[PDB]
Structure formats: structure tokens, C-alpha cells
Amino acid sequence: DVVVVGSGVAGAIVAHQLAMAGKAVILLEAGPRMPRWEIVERFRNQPDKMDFMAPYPSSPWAPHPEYGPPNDYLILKGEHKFNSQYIRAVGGTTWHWAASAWRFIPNDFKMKSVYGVGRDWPIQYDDLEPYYQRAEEELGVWGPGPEEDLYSPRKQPYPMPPLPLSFNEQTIKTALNNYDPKFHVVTEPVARNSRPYDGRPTCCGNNNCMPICPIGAMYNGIVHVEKAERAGAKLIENAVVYKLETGPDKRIVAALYKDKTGAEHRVEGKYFVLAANGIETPKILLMSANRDFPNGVANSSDMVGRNLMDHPGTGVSFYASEKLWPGRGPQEMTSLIGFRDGPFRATEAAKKIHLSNLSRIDQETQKIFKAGKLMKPDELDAQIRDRSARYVQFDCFHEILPQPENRIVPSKTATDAIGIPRPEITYAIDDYVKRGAAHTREVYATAAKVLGGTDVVFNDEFAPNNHITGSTIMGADARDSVVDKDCRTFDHPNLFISSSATMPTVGTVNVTLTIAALALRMSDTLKKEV
Amino acid sequence: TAPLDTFMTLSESLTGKKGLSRVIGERLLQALQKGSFKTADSLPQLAGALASGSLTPEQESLALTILEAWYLGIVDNVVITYEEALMFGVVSDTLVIRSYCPNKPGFWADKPIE
Ligand SMILES: *Cc1cc2c(cc1C)nc1c(=O)[nH]c(=O)nc-1n2C[C@H](O)[C@H](O)[C@H](O)COP(=O)(O)OP(=O)(O)OC[C@H]1O[C@@H](n2cnc3c(N)ncnc32)[C@H](O)[C@@H]1O
Ligand code: F3S
């Protein structure tokens, strides 16, 4: 009936919707089923608790990127590393996310028209709103009410209100908004429970959201996998897909997948949804070149794997003069959103900026022992407490504009343990981002000044942020674009792509709520095809 | 007086904490032995120099290494323990150990009391 490929959120929502409307479903997950208690124990037993991939092993047959230390799965060329993370396992990469759950703002959808750069969406905010709201309700998202304007106009209030801000984050909101109300520091919307919700407990302040909440007080992809399964979808773990076959009638006829042995298998149904992620999905597509489609399925555009995007990151850290004590409650409760929009967006990149509320005991204890100076236990404790108390760090997402030379292709040369080719990402970061970043570095310096900042360190190397978007871009017309404004493939009237791959613009904020929205949209549209 | 005995009394002096666990102490010892404490004279010599007089940079640096292990709970990028790592007890009044709830919940709006 429907084969869905990818058991993350993008694809589990879809699977759950349809198997609810009775129409029988098959969900293929490359990775294995690993339960929460195991991820947790793996975390407790990892030596660098700042490595958010570390408690998620790459299966030989369905590997994913690692960097503590490198496993080399991705082939990175170009001028910059696309060292984003993701997880291959039942439930997908939102095992390990922060559950930041934003909406894009209206102008984000009309970037060339309005700002004369990048590239419009076909649909616009209006069209997405009611799906945002449904996504918020399905994920369980809390957020502020009318006392704070998040610049994406709402029909309903948030399903939940925030838990109170930590001292750290409220004090800094108050101080920063008092220096410059332009900054508009606000409480951040997040897929996390301020009360018992859809059967999940309220948030307790494990301060471990990356890389696992132990109790599921925040949303994880697994929630809708389990939903889909009770609603009668068939989960097949360790089924890693490497080809879709195109049938005579131009549609999609089957998906081919290797198990953990390298042995090959074949799955048929009526409709096909790729919700692999923004890398593995292009990869499957081009692995699938064949007689009638010499350029790889859905790629009459030449745009598949292309347009690849993520939020080039940039940071500051210092010791504040006031005590603040990061590490209490969630790792992020707040954001500084006053530069998501502006005329400047024609010249240079917009950002969201966010203060970290991560515990820094380890970090700052480690630091002190590096100074190579024996202390009386009392000095040592005094200092651990003080340093851990006063550390502050800001990071940020910059927008990067969709660019066709930024792309992922399946390696001609390199391969994995079961004989599937490997992602080869070319990627560069141009002056649009870099001029945005120069302004950010000034906000940072000002934040430091305001907060009595000491030992200020600027982090000017662009970090990844795991927001993998572009690679099957969304279009009006089917040749500079892969999917219509419904995430139907232009080339295959029975293939949809549920992923941030589809998003032509990456905007200023975490992309996953938008995905959840598109997923529900798609699932409506598909519910109509008997 | 075996190596453990000396280790344990050493660590007490260095950490200032009474009632350090010998079960964990054993494990830290054995991991530290992989590639520290060249001799068998090191531990005793460290105790005497510490207890009374004063330390070579090298001796200082051994003491640090011992301290490092108790406070971080890790030795050569292996976790010996997580809960009982001492840095957490130094801030247990205010900060949680990541992945462990406070026994009563949403506490964190307060400014901590010094
Ligand atoms: C790493 C990370 C990511 C992250 C984050 C923090 C961290 C540390 N914080 C986020 C946040 O605050 N807000 C947000 O919106 N996103 C955040 N992210 C990224 C987020 O996890 C992703 O955007 C999200 O997971 C995307 O959802 P999607 O379902 O599209 O992708 P996925 O969760 O990676 O799931 C993909 C599944 O498909 C399977 N797969 C892949 N290839 C294949 C093949 N060939 N065959 C079969 N299955 C396949 C994967 O196994 C995976 O389960
Ligand atoms: S990991 Fe879990 S309970 Fe609260 S702050 Fe983070 S969600």
C-alpha cells in the first residue's frame, strides 16, 4: 500500500497518519532498534559527554558520521566541511536533538522576491500555519504567549506554557533586552513537557537533552514509530534501501534494500515516501539511475543532492562577573531572535542567537587540572564552583543560501561494508554568511561587555548544526526543482519526499518543526489517494 | 601496607574527603597503573613528600593525576565512574548530574545560595 523509507519523525508521522486511516503501511529503517535505557547507559559510560553522537554506534550496515574520532563515512571536499551529524536507527536523529521547535517566519518563504537573493518557496506561511499548529500539538511543544512576539503569527496558543526560565537565562534575558530591546531575547519554543502530555512525563531537568533525555519528557522520533506500530504499520529494522525501481508507467514500482548481511530484498506497494534524511535520501535517489532515468530517479532537474544547506555556526564564551550557574533545567530555554529579519537580508545573513544553559562542571574542572597546579581541596572546590558558576556561552545559526554547487553525490570510488556507495559532500560557505557573521561577532562582544565578560574567547570557525536541507529542493516548475509544492516528485506522481531536503530555504532556526508540518500536510494529501 | 592502602590515604589527603570508596578506589588505582606509577616507590614516596615536606614538579604532577582521576572519574578516556566522580559532589547543592533528575523537580528559577 505505502512503503515509507526512514523511521525518523519525518517518516514516522506519515506512516502513523496513513495506518490510522486504515491503509496498510510498511516502514523501512536502515538501522537497528535500540531502546532508551541503552542509549542512556551508553551515555553514562562515554568519556566525552560533549560528543552527542557517541552513545549512538554506527552499525556496519547502516553507518552514520562520527568525529570522536573520525570514522570517515562522509567524504568531505570543497572549501568547508559538512560535518553535520545524524543517527541511523529506529526513531532517527531526534533521539539526540535539543527539541527546539520553531516556525519559519513569513519572509523566509519569499526570499528572492523580497530580498532578491536565494529563492522563494512556492507555498507561503499562510499555507503552513495550521500544520505548524498540528505539528506542535503532535510533538508536544511549549512556548510563550502574547507577552513575547516570535514573529510567526499564530491562530492558537502553544499547547503548553514554558516551565520557568532558569536563573541563568532569565537574568540574561533581562539584562540583554535592557541594553538593547532590538535583540528581543525571548523564551524558546521546544518539544518538551511542562506537564504530563500524550503519556509522557513532565521535564525534570536532567540537563541532558542532547544526547538523551532518560525519561522522554521531550519529544523523540520514536514516539510516532511506536504510534505507527500500534496503528498497524509494519516496522522492518535493519533494512537499508539502495534502489527504487521505476515501472513502465513512469511511476515507482519497488524499493530494493539490503539487510545487515548485504543480502538483497524487494518491497512493493502503491505509494512511496522517502524520509531518509537530507543526505541519505539524495543518495538513494541517484543510486537508482536506470534505463528510463539515466540521471537517477527524480533528477530530470539535475538538482538532486544539490542546493545543500545547513546553519553555519559561530560562538562566544567568557566568565561573567555575576554568578549564573548554567546547567539547571534544560540545555536551552531561550533565544535572541531580533536578527532573523531585516532589509539587511539582501546584503548579508540573518541569524538566531542562543545562550547555552548546559552544565559546565566537567569542562571547568578539566580546565583547572590543565593549569598543572596542585591546590588544597578547598581552593580547588572554591574555584570549580566559581568557574562553573560564571561561564557563559552564546552560539548562533546563520542562514546559508541554496547553492547548486553545494551538493551531495554518491561516491564513484568509496563504499561501505555492504557495498553501498558513500556520501560525497562538496560544500563552501560564501561571503553572504561571512558578512552576517561579522555583525554577530559584534553582538557577541557587546553581550560580553554588558555581562562583565572576562576571558572572552571568540569562536569564529563555522560549526555544523545538523540541519540538513535543500537536497531535493521544492519548486514551482520541475526543472530547477525536484518536488512540487506538495512534496510530490515531478518525475514520479507516486513518490513523495518527507524531509528537510525539500525545503528550498534553511532560514534562521532549527528545521525539524517545519518538517513535522510538511509531513502532516503530505499525509493529508496522500490520505486522499485511496 | 599494600598499594591500595597508600593510594587511599593519599587520595584522602589530596581530596580532603573522608570516606572515599575503596571499591572505586581500587578501580582507579588499576586504571592509573596502566601507565602511571613507574616504580613501586612512587606512591609511598609521594605520601611522605606530601604529608610533610614538598614536591618535585614531577611529584606535584603525580598528585594532580591522582586528583584528576577522583574528580573526573575518568582515566585515559575510560569512565571508571560517573555518579561518584567527586566534582559533582562539590556542586551537588545546586547542579545536577546530567541524566539524573533532582528528587523534587522544577527547582531552577531560584538563584543558588552560596
Ligand atoms: C544531531 C542533532 C540534531 C538536531 C539537534 C541537536 C543535535 C545534537 N537539535 C535540533 C533542534 O533543536 N531542532 C531541530 O529542529 N532539529 C534539531 N536537530 C536535527 C534533527 O534531529 C533533524 O532535523 C531531524 O531528525 C530530521 O528528521 P528526519 O526524520 O527527516 O531525519 P532523521 O531523524 O535523521 O531520520 C531519518 C531516518 O531515515 C533512516 N534512513 C536513512 N537512510 C536510509 C536508507 N537508505 N534506508 C533505510 N533507512 C534510512 C535513518 O536510519 C533515520 O532513522
Ligand atoms: S533531557 Fe530530559 S527531563 Fe528535561 S531538560 Fe532535557 S528534557
Author numbering:
A (entry chain B): 10 to 539
B (entry chain A): 52 to 165
List passages from the publication reporting this PDB structure.
Our research group has been studying a representative FAD-dependent dehydrogenase complex (FADGDH) derived from Burkholderia cepacia SM4 (BcGDH). Owing to the presence of the β-subunit, BcGDH is capable of transferring electrons directly to an electrode, making it an ideal molecule for glucose sensors and applications in a variety of biomedical devices. In this study, we determined the X-ray structure of BcGDHγα, consisting of the BcGDH catalytic subunit complexed with the small (hitchhiker) subunit.
In the crystal, two pairs of BcGDHγα complexes were observed in the asymmetric unit. The simulated-annealing OMIT maps of sulfur ions in the iron–sulfur cluster and the disulfide bond indicated that this iron–sulfur cluster is a 3Fe–4S cluster coordinated by Cys212, Cys218 and Cys222 of the α-subunit. A neighboring cysteine, Cys213, in the α-subunit forms a disulfide bond with Cys152 of the γ-subunit. The unique cysteine cluster of BcGDHγα contributes to the formation of the 3Fe–4S cluster for electron transfer and the disulfide bond for stabilization of the structure of the γα complex. The distance between N5 of FAD and the 3Fe–4S cluster is about 12–13 Å, which is an adequate distance for electron transfer.
